[PDB]
Amino acid sequence: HMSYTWTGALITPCAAEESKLPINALSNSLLRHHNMVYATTSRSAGLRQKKVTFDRLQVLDDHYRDVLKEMKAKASTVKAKLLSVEEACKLTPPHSAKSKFGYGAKDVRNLSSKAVNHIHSVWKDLLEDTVTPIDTTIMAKNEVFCVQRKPARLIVFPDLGVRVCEKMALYDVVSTLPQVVMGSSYGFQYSPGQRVEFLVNTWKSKKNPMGFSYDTRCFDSTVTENDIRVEESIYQCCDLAPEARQAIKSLTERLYIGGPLTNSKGQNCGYRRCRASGVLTTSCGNTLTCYLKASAACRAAKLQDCTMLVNGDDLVVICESAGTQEDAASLRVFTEAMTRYSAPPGDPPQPEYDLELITSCSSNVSVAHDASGKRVYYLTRDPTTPLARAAWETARHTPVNSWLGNIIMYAPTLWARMILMTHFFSILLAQEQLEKALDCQIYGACYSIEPLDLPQIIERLHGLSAFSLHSYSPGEINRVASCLRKLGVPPLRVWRHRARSVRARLLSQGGRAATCGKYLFNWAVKTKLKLTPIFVAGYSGGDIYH
Ligand SMILES: COC1=NC(=O)C(c2cc(C(C)(C)C)c(OC)c3cc(-c4ccc(NS(C)(=O)=O)cc4)cnc23)=CC1
Ligand SMILES: [Zn+2]
């Protein structure tokens, strides 16, 4: 039961690949230590192949089937609708991978006869064929990081035509099922603001709180045939159209369980026997399989009052502490159970006795103060990776504007407000690309956002408080400061001086730009202004556009 079998054919790119940070005129106003920032390519694919290739041994006990029986009971109350070709076509990202059968994502979005005719033949094939493995494409992702050098992550996806079919069979499923089965444990339903409220209320609900996070060493590669069939059986509990059931069974058997891996150049690289990173059910499947293994492992560990928060492969549990030694013991039992279930860790979990110390989805809770001086909890993260990607997006146009997603998801943070908002707003002013809508990614889902609508969007995700936050924790201040030192980012005082200019330039433009300057940059001025008023699921790898 190997996660992958290989032939020897290399994972090849489509176009030109850049590993070194591209430098332009705006580069130095953000980052000086350019050699620190790199992007991954198909060059490092071989190392990834080695890492992701291992044999999986599973030992399923009564807690596992007990939890599963509960999940299947909740899943049977779900009703899911079969999407139409048109409905599925409209949920396709505009810069999604083109089909091998002619047409592209925009052809799809325009409901073009060539595309719609092809989508109709794939659907017919799924309904009349449940054995033939569906061909997938293996590709190295091009992602930006800071040093300490990671090998390129892999993306395995079926043809665009198959992807519109997955949308027809499972879009309403992956959207409604995780919330029913897992309830408040399902994280992809929360805004960052509601994610905080949940965590804080959870920590406050425990007498002696204890929290930990669980990082699976390459989760996708640990997902076995069993796990994918289990997922299908969960989906099959729903009230589904007969066409949908059949389509789910064929997509599972032919695509989701495994299949052959093809490079961009058309060769066979090998065979997959685990989770495909670029399928509609990647997020949902991973969330179900993580929650199923962790809930069962919580019971195996006899963990008092387990409160989970699962997002794909990221797990955060908050429970009742039994002292640092018994808690350390319990987590070993948990890690033993998780490994038996074929979900071992990279770094084994550590008990945390302070909410602000648990690392949930590369983020953590932190405290600052509002206008009234009231202690306010918000979500932040290490600015290293966001700032390194921001540097890439200063000289290169990407299909995903990470700086835009980082401004959205981390709006009340010190770093996103001071550096990211300032830098990119001066760029948008200079180019007059302020009214131009930009494509970004949130929870793995593709979004087209008008940058001038940012104060409206931020208020709706965090509240007016995000525009009034101050007096940040010294632990947070120091993480940012040390990061600014690492990458060679100008200090915060430089950014406050720059934000005054951005704000002054923004008021002069009037309209939404004046609101942008008034709400986003109010923190920079010595004469403050009275700021007034103006989430369902995660689709990581799912190929979804809203
Ligand atoms: C640059 O654009 C950004 N867009 C985003 O959506 C976020 C973001 C933020 C957060 C918060 C803690 C701030 C709420 C996340 O946690 C829920 C997020 C969790 C994820 C996430 C994605 C995939 C998976 N699991 S998987 C690999 O597919 O199996 C698990 C979690 C993605 N983005 C998250 C940050 C930056
Ligand atoms: Zn039992």
UniProtKB/Swiss-Prot annotation:
Domain RdRp catalytic: 209-327
Location of Phosphoserine modifications: S29, S42
Effect caused by changing N286K: Complete loss of RdRp activity
Topology with respect to the bilayer: Single-pass type IV membrane protein
Post-translational modification: The N-terminus is phosphorylated by host PRK2/PKN2.
Regulation: Activity is up-regulated by PRK2/PKN2-mediated phosphorylation.
Cofactor(s), names only, from the UniProt record: Mg(2+)
Positions with a binding annotation for Mg(2+) 2: D215, D313, D314
Superkingdom of source: Viruses
Catalytic activity: RNA(n) + a ribonucleoside 5'-triphosphate = RNA(n+1) + diphosphate
UniProt cofactor note: Binds 2 magnesium ion that constitute a dinuclear catalytic metal center.
Effect the entry attributes to changing G312 to A/C: Almost complete loss of RdRp activity
Outcome when changing D220 to G/N: Complete loss of RdRp activity
Subcellular location(s) per record: Host cytoplasm; Host endoplasmic reticulum membrane
Function: RNA-dependent RNA polymerase that performs primer-template recognition and RNA synthesis during viral replication. Initiates RNA transcription/replication at a flavin adenine dinucleotide (FAD), resulting in a 5'- FAD cap on viral RNAs. In this way, recognition of viral 5' RNA by host pattern recognition receptors can be bypassed, thereby evading activation of antiviral pathways.
Subunit architecture: Homooligomer. Interacts with non-structural protein 5A. Interacts with host VAPB. Interacts with host PRK2/PKN2. Interacts with host HNRNPA1 and SEPT6; these interactions facilitate the viral replication. Part of the replication complex composed of NS2, NS3, NS4A, NS4B, NS5A and the RNA-directed RNA polymerase embedded in an ER-derived membranous web.
Protein name: RNA-directed RNA polymerase
Organism: Hepatitis C virus genotype 1b (isolate BK)
